Paper text:
Here we present the high-resolution cryo-EM structure of amyloid fibrils of the Src-homology 3 domain of phosphatidyl-inositol-3-kinase (PI3K-SH3). The structure of natively folded PI3K-SH3, a domain consisting of 86 amino acids from bovine PI3K, has been well-characterised by X-ray crystallography and NMR spectroscopy. SH3 domains are known to play a significant role in several signalling pathways where they mediate protein-protein interactions by recognising PxxP sequence motifs. Used initially as a model system for protein folding studies, PI3K-SH3 was among the first proteins discovered to form amyloid fibrils in the test tube, while not being associated to any known human disease.
A three-dimensional density map for the thick PI3K-SH3 fibril could be reconstructed to an overall resolution of 3.4 Å. The clear density of the fibril allowed us to build an atomic model for residues 1–77 out of a total of 86 amino acids. The missing nine residues are located at the C-terminus, which shows blurred density likely due to substantial flexibility. The thick PI3K-SH3 fibril is a left-handed helical structure consisting of two intertwined protofilaments, and is thus called DF (double filament) fibril. Protofilament subunits (PI3K-SH3 monomers) are stacked in a parallel, in-register cross-β structure. The helical symmetry is therefore described by a twist of 179.4 ° and rise of 2.35 Å, which corresponds to an approximate 21-screw symmetry. Each protofilament subunit, or PI3K-SH3 monomer, consists of seven parallel in-register β-strands (β1, aa1-5; β2, aa7-19; β3, aa22-26; β4, aa28-34; β5, aa46-56; β6, aa59-68; β7, aa72-77) that are interrupted by either sharp kinks, glycine or proline residues—or a combination of those. By encompassing 13 residues of each monomer, 26 in total, the inter-filament interface of the PI3K-SH3 DF fibril is very large. The protofilaments mainly interact through two identical symmetry-related hydrophobic patches at the periphery of their interface, between the bottom part of the bent β-arch motif and the respective C-terminal part of the opposing protofilament. A single subunit in the PI3K-SH3 DF fibril is not planar but winds itself along the protofilament axis, which leads to interlocking within a protofilament.
Residue numbers in the entry:
A (entry chain G), B (entry chain E), C (entry chain C), D (entry chain A), E (entry chain B), F (entry chain D), ...: 1 to 77
The structure:
């Protein structure tokens, strides 16, 4: 198993578990705004994205790309 | 197994589990705005995307690309 | 198994599981706006996309591309 | 198995599971606007797309492309 | 006299001159290409625009806009 | 006289001159390419714009905009 | 006379001169390429713009903007 490169997160997972009778309770979320609000530039104001998912066993991206996003791929063979 | 490159998330998952009788309760989400709001530039105001999914076992993208997005692919063979 | 490149998420999934009698309760989502709102530029106001899906076992894109999006593919063989 | 390239999500899924007697309850979504609203530019106001799907086992795109979208394919053989 | 703003070239010219018996000789321009040439992407090859003007006393634009050019004007009064 | 702002070139010219019997000789320009040339991406090859002007007393733009050029003006009054 | 701001070149010119019988000789320019050339990315190859002007007394821009150029103006009054 090999990895190289600049900024990478390479988890090599090997887990074997028996997990029984778990009760887990999170709680709720409240965001309140009262009053006059002015937001300027790369500001936000009150950015508030509610994402409620149950049973993540795969892959999830919630990707907010806000701005100016260039990308150049260059390969010589 | 090999990986290289600039900013990558290469998880190599191997998990074998038995998971029984789990009760899990999240809770709710409330966002409130009272008052006069002015948003300018790459600001947001109150951006609030509700995504409720149950049983993610595959792949999910919620991708908000807001702005100016160039992309150039260049390959020499 | 090989991977290279600039910003990639290469998950190599291998999972073998037995999962029984799970009760899971999420909760609800409320977004409220009271008052005069002015949104300018790449702002949003209150962007609020409700996506309720059950049993994601495959692929999902909710892709909001808002703005100016060029793309150039160039390949020499 | 090989992958290269600029910004890619290459999941190589291999999952073998037995999944029984799951009860899962999401909850509902409410978005409220009271008051005078002015939206300008690449703003939104209250963009609110309700997508309720059950049993995603394949592929799904909800793609909102709002703006100016050029694309050039160039290939030399 | 007032100026503000992001990237501006505000010349405030005040010149009072007496200019006599000037002899000025520029010379010529030659561009030669020999050989096989392949140009790809936002490349050029040999872009070679000959502009010969005499006695510029006003305004001149030779503007080569090659590509993808969006522009949005937004004004609230 | 006032100036502010981000990246500006504000020349405030006041010049009063007597300029007599000047002989000035520039010389010529030759660009030669021999051989096989391949240009890829935002490359150029041999970009070679010949601009010969005599007696610039006003304004001149030779503007090569090659690529992807968005612009957003946003003003609240 | 006032100036402020981030990166500015504010020349406040006041010049009063008598300039007589000047002989000035520049010389010529030759660029030669022999051989196989490959240029990739934001490379150039041999970019070679010949600009021969005589008697610049005003303003001149030779502006090569090659790439991805966003600009956002935002002003609240």
């Amino acid at each position: 198993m090999s990895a190289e490169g600049y900024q990478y997160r390479a988890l090599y997972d090997y887990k074997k578990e028996r997990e029984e009778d778990i009760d887990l309770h999170l709680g709720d979320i409240l965001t309140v705004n009262k009053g006059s609000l002015v937001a300027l530039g790369f500001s936000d104001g009150q950015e508030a994205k509610p994402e409620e998912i149950g049973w993540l066993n795969g892959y999830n991206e919630t990707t907010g790309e806000r701005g100016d996003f260039p990308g150049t791929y260059v390969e010589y063979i």
